[PDB]
Amino acid sequence: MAGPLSGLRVVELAGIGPGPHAAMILGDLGADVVRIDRPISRDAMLRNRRIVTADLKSDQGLELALKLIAKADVLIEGYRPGVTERLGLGPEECAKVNDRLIYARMTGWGQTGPRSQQAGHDINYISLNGILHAIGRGDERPVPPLNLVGAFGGGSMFLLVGILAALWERQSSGKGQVVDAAMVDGSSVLIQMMWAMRATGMWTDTRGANMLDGGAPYYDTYECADGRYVAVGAIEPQFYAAMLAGLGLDAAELPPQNDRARWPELRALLTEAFASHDRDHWGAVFANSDACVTPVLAFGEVHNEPHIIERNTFYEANGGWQPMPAPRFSRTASSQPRPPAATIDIEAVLTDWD
Amino acid sequence: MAGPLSGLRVVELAGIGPGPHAAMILGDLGADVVRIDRPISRDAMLRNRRIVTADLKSDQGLELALKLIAKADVLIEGYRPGVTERLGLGPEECAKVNDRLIYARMTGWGQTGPRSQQAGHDINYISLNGILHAIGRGDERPVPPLNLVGAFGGGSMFLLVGILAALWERQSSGKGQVVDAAMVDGSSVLIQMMWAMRATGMWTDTRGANMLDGGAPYYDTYECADGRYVAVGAIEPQFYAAMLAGLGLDAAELPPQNDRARWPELRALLTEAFASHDRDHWGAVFANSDACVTPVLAFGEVHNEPHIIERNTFYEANGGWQPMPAPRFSRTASSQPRPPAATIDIEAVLTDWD
């Protein structure tokens, strides 16, 4: 199995959202992941694993799971706190058979505290820590940024960081430990720059009125003649200048870039410029310069974009595209993911594991 | 220094956005991070660092930087590709002094390809891979989800994963390597769930008309009588039933939860219910339930929320609050971050590092 985590053994207790995503990325980087599900997937996310079946509520399944866990470097579970405990698969039980295990617990609210037994989803976790409130236009209610911020950015990615950091600690202690990755916590650290900025006057709690939330005319999308969009990210003065040039606007005729009192006027002039031609026209004008202007591609258009083609950011699968592994490693590169295959018998994995 | 990465040595070449975020989290987790800037910060992101200065364009500075790098496990750089090369700090030159070094390159477009030399920001990177198009209400142009998706979720967090993955690899190969972390790639893996779902009809390219983007009435925010908001994430039927129960809506008088043709009617009925009382009302109603109904807190209110208090998700620093380290480790816990301190002498760090 190619990639830097070749040799790592992972047991994933089947769930939804951040747990399978973390398992996926360990698999993409070369780990040997075995997912235990209840008694061929069409779900590209279940790439790079073996799937086995056991009833964990039964003496036989629990015993088979414990044998797998005994041989594993990492366990991923994403149930409510207390669930693995009552199944016989809690950290203290696993430590009995394997004190080198990294026991990685992926929740929204965390292992403890007043909400920790309450159901939730991404939207809920980013609602409680200020994030959701900060997303969207000022004249509308907050819009969810899909489940990119709680489940993945602040969820699976922090579980991964915790797993891989604990493996580093294990090299000198000779032991594992439990990683408590809560989406409410990871997402907060993900947005740490905004928490920094609020202490210095560089971020307000006022929605849709900041440098990076669409409040700034030079950091936003604009609708083009064809009803399609471009994105403008020209924060630096020189990038801003290149953008005005591409639009054919004379800077002398415009308000200063950071005259906030005249931002409505600047936005209006930029709106009128972009509206005067179709997205593809601006994509060509701005293809090479430092103007920080890009066409806003829909998913179905991405695979035709030159920078996307040349770097092989995606590969074909199941009639559609899936992203290749990231990040990229110069010496122990990952390969193209292996599709979800047929279930295997669990005793065969146990056999293979030495 | 407390946490799982105690003992790791990181050199960060001072930059903006994802590179310092990555260095911060390594420091948070106990790493010994030394940031080289140009010749006391009030930026909380520069927590858990020693800051030194060197002119990398001068013979003397190049030499001091190489001596630091010779003692390090990790180098983080976020310049345009080619920049460290021309300075004499490129991967090949570092390898001559330290072939164990994990050389972590944090860019938007990646090391190679047609855009690799072009300026950009977060909004640009997520515009070319389908992400930005997917964010926002269907009747408005796309809205940037701050810089959480490109810079951090699909940026620093992939850099971190690659650093820690390559450290794992080194434990068996004895050697380091280069990590090419491109925000355009990392963000695409971040959103894999959507790429998977597109192939099975579980996600469409139509904006604002899916399960997780505000298209679904049970997965969205709602404005309350006070003009503040709740978030509803009640996907599963039993959570949805609990949400109806709290509102006191009779399900027999409503459209079925997943009759999409009647989602306008469902939304309007939910809108009228949540608008009838203030946000804090709904916190009382839904207490201890699985309704997936939470208050949408502004940043300035977060520190008063009981679940946030009880778990010490934040700590007080400088102006306001800053997020504590995440994720959390049972045996080698991180401690409260060290503030930015005065610049120190680079020869002093070398003496420290030997």
Numbering used by the authors:
A (entry chain A), B (entry chain B): 1 to 39, 45 to 359
Tell me, in the authors' exact words, what the paper reports:
α-Methylacyl-CoA racemase in M. tuberculosis (MCR) has an essential role in fatty acid metabolism and cholesterol utilization, contributing to the bacterium’s survival and persistence. It catalyses the racemization of α-methyl-branched fatty acyl-CoAs, converting the (2S)-epimer to a near racemic mixture of the (2R)- and (2S)-epimers. The enzyme enables the conversion of α-methyl-branched fatty acids derived from cholesterol metabolism into forms that can be utilized by M. tuberculosis for growth and persistence within the host, a key component of M. tuberculosis pathogenesis. Within each active site, the large domain contributes the catalytic residues H126 (part of α-helix 3) and D156 (part of α-helix 5), while the small domain contributes a third catalytic residue, E241 (part of α-helix 9).
Crystals of the three MCR mutants H126A, D156A and E241A were obtained using identical conditions to those used with the wild-type enzyme and diffracted to 2.45, 1.64 and 1.85 Å resolutions, respectively. The overall structures for these single mutants were very similar to those of the wild-type structure, with small root-mean-squared deviation (RMSD) differences of 0.38, 0.37 and 0.38 Å for 693 Cα atoms of the H126A, D156A and E241A mutant structures being observed, respectively. The three mutants collectively had fewer hydrogen bond interactions; within the H126A, D156A and E241A mutants, 3, 5 and 5 interactions were observed, respectively. The active site of the D156A mutant has the fewest structural changes, as the H126-and-D241 dyad is retained along with the associated hydrogen bonding interactions. Within the wild-type, the D156 side-chain is hydrogen-bonded to a PEG molecule and a water molecule (which form part of a network which terminates with Y130) and a peripheral N152 residue. Consequently, as this D156 side-chain is mutated to Ala, these interactions are lost. Interestingly, the orientation peripheral N152 residue is unaffected and can form a hydrogen bond with part of the PEG molecule compared to the wild-type and the two other mutants. The rate-against-amount of enzyme plots show the expected enzyme-dependent increase in rate, while the specific activities calculated for wild-type, H126A, D156A and E241A were 46.4, 3.2, 18.5 and 12.2 µmol.min−1.mg−1. No significant change outside the enzymatic active site was observed in the three mutants, establishing that the diminution of catalytic activity is mainly attributable to disruption of the catalytic apparatus involving key hydrogen bonding and water-mediated interactions.
